[PDB]
Design a protein around this ligand. Structure first.
Ligand SMILES: CC1=N[C@@](C)(c2ccc(Cl)cc2)[C@@](C)(c2ccc(Cl)cc2)N1C(=O)N1CCN(CCCS(C)(=O)=O)CC1
Length: 86
């Protein structure tokens, strides 16, 4: 079986805000809902479509960054791991 992960309170609140309805997830599911949140809040750069702007959004505090690229997968996994129950 795939390992299920357990978001800490802030990340959990974001994921539910995007439509998640449980407390544990596969990493694929966490990433899906995070992607939905980003799309819904229109955080993508208009011209460089892989760039996500967080400086005006609570996601910035959650991840601890001002911008990131969706191509930086190791970085995104790291940002999520800091917000999982160990
Ligand atoms: C762009 C994109 N890549 C994904 C698959 C991704 C999977 C894993 C990892 Cl580590 C990183 C990225 C994902 C799911 C995502 C997931 C999490 C985050 Cl933080 C951002 C994006 N994603 C996504 O949600 N979207 C939103 C933007 N859409 C843009 C479509 C427009 S077009 C012209 O390209 O058809 C499609 C992809």
């Amino acid at each position: 079986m795939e390992k299920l992960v357990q978001p800490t309170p802030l990340l959990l609140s974001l994921l539910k805000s995007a439509g998640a309805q449980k407390e544990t997830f596969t990493m694929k599911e966490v990433l899906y809902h995070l992607g939905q949140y980003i799309m819904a809040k229109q955080l993508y750069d208009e011209k460089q479509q892989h760039i996500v702007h967080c400086s005006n959004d609570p996601l910035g505090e959650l991840f601890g960054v001002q911008e990131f690229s969706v191509k930086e997968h190791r970085r995104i996994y790291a940002m999520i791991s800091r917000n999982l129950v160990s």
